[PDB]
Ligand binder design. Structure first.
Ligand SMILES: Nc1nc2c(CCNCC3CCCC3)c3[nH]c(NCCc4ccccc4)nc3cc2c(=O)[nH]1
Ligand SMILES: Nc1nc2c(CCNCC3CCCC3)c3[nH]c(NCCc4ccccc4)nc3cc2c(=O)[nH]1
Ligand SMILES: [Zn+2]
Ligand SMILES: [Zn+2]
Lengths: 354, 354
């Protein structure tokens, strides 16, 4: 496989399905990336069995513990955690004294790219500022412009590290809050620098689905069509469907994992809270259709018991199911786009989910 | 398979190796029984892969949540938790207003046997009193005598339930504290009633290994030779070896599970606490020889990181390793007895473990 190759196999409206080929493996798009140096309560083999092709790691948390340098000493993140497929790392740009140099908590564009190198990241995110919401036009602009200067510094840091440049990919992050002209300026800046892929940053920061969707409507077309489009931090199953309808190819969210531990299970009929007393003697699986190993073997009643009891196995089972659900959603999306029936799938999904 | 058949295949001194055959499966002895309606942080398939043939459940905890009747409604403990092999249940006699009728917390011999039935237990423990340590001779005697009266009531309750009597086994529990004459009286009483197996109760209650061993020296020979001998709540790897040298066939302990979650890993060179800084960059597996999946795939360094971070996967990995260690210990014991070299194994084990 090449360092990076994105190929679109089929389209329906703005939606696309295809593959990203990288040295450590192939990524099917639209893709959901479970978030980790562990995907909480799952062994990597379990993550893989659910259908994930790539997972996310984090510059900020890993740099604190166990340390970037320590992980490199030990062989890199892949060997450390036992996941041999691609890993995307965020830059630390979401998760203090700020300056043009970077942020003291030190993290700058250069340090962020170095940490991702030390971790052995396959997909490296530029170091950005995730603009708070709401933001005035002035502040959104100032923040966006800084991020574009940091995007150039990120590019140059990545490129000056031969091993990194030859084996990893670099994504740029569009900012601009909810303002069309700032999103356009940002897209233009990023395309001028040139990246392997383009994220839509600064959303899922409290604006609400309708606003998020309105911003995606004009922002995604601004990005290079022939490169992947990554919506950072999204989201609920319905957010995902609507975002793919607007041209997004990649997603990460802590919801399936976090939710899972707190008792929320995703189903095709909508989310359920398994701790509710109504499930205490319910012998059916979490979801009627789900092909995951949890739904093949255990009942709602048992998982209800486990979560109310605080048992670790409850977290394990809920998290495996939810990540499997998300991957099954992505597979249905991929298949429906490839077959030219995604708009019908989206409508069907929504009518049942809601 | 029959309801219950114990066969001794080989002996060395007081040590024995063989099999217990029951309807849900075969149990290799000497046996270690992991303790659970979950073996903490492990799926049942994982428990089975470590080599366990039987696991333990608990009358007391299950009767509180989710309830005995509720579990029966749902199909019994085996279907509920997804473990289809034998299950031994304790009576609640270790774990309030006491009277000859039973104990109010209500639990009596009759209720205890009924709860174990409702759970679908394969090996049912008589309802007893675990005599506090230290105990004077008077109190130990009074307590032992009550337990023997409760043993008869347990026998009669079990026998009056046809389904239970035809499909499950019943073990009696010897008491008498540390006093030889009370242990003999108790053994005699239990043999007169007649059970499928005989536990040594009232040990591992703070007396210390030397005293425990001295009591086993005279107490185990008092029990029927042709029936299994179960030492309740023991213990550390070295307790297990010494107890098998004294005629014990079955063991349960929460140590491998509890220890695992708290950072203590068992190794052939003795226990280690994985949180110690010395393991932070140690790429070796938990144990050099261990065949478990954890030692095949992850380093001390990674598990160190996980446990210090409070990650669930750390508990999962530590617990799988420790239960695998215990099963490998049992296999080495079984093999060494069958080959007539257990005394040498015991000495070798101790010299390296300590
Ligand atoms: N560099 C960068 N990162 C962003 C992130 C983090 C994406 N997940 C990273 C993982 C790395 C490890 C942790 C996260 C975002 N996450 C969200 N929404 C999350 C909202 C949410 C919160 C809790 C639950 C569900 C959703 N918006 C984000 C915007 C940006 C952004 O502009 N720039
Ligand atoms: N009916 C009965 N049960 C006893 C138990 C419980 C055995 N494990 C049951 C499982 C069912 C679910 C929970 C336990 C005992 N456990 C111990 N020692 C444990 C000491 C220990 C404590 C903590 C960690 C390691 C060892 N002595 C015991 C004596 C008796 C006894 O006479 N009668
Ligand atoms: Zn499922
Ligand atoms: Zn191991």
């Amino acid at each position: 496989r090449p360092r990076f190759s994105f190929s679109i196999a089929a389209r329906e409206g703005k939606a696309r399905t295809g593959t990203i080929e990288m040295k450590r493996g192939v990524i099917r798009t639209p893709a959901f990336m479970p978030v980790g140096a562990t995907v909480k309560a799952l062994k990597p083999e379990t993550v893989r069995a659910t259908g994930a092709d790539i997972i996310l790691g984090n510059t900020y948390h890993l740099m604190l513990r166990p340390g970037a340098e320590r992980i490199a000493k030990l062989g890199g993140l892949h060997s450390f955690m036992g996941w041999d497929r691609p890993i995307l790392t965020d830059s630390g740009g979401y998760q203090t004294k700020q300056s043009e140099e970077g942020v003291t908590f030190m993290l700058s564009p250069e340090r962020s790219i170095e940490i991702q190198h030390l971790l052995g990241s396959d997909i490296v995110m530029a170091f950005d500022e995730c603009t708070p919401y709401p933001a005035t036009p002035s502040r959104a602009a100032s923040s966006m412009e800084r991020s574009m200067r940091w995007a150039k510094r990120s590019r140059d840091a990545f490129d000056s590290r031969k091993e990194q440049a030859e084996n990893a990919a670099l994504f740029g992050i569009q900012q601009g809050s909810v303002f069309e002209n700032l999103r356009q300026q940002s897209a233009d800046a990023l395309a001028e620098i040139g990246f392997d892929g383009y994220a839509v940053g600064g959303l899922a920061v409290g604006e609400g689905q309708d606003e998020m969707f309105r911003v995606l409507d004009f922002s995604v077309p601004m990005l290079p069509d022939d490169k992947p489009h990554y919506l950072m931090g999204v989201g609920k199953p319905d957010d995902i469907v609507g975002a793919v309808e607007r041209g997004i190819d990649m997603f990460d969210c802590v919801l399936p994992t976090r939710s899972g531990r707190n008792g929320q299970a995703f189903t095709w009929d909508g989310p359920i809270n398994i701790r509710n007393a109504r499930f205490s003697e319910d012998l059916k699986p979490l979801d009627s259709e789900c092909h995951c190993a949890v739904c093949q073997k255990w009942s709602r009643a048992y998982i209800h018991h486990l979560i109310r009891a605080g048992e670790i196995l409850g977290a394990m089972l809920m998290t495996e199911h939810n990540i499997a659900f998300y991957q099954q959603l992505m597979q249905k999306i991929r298949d429906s786009i490839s077959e030219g029936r995604f708009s019908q799938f989206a409508q069907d999904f929504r009518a049942r989910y809601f």
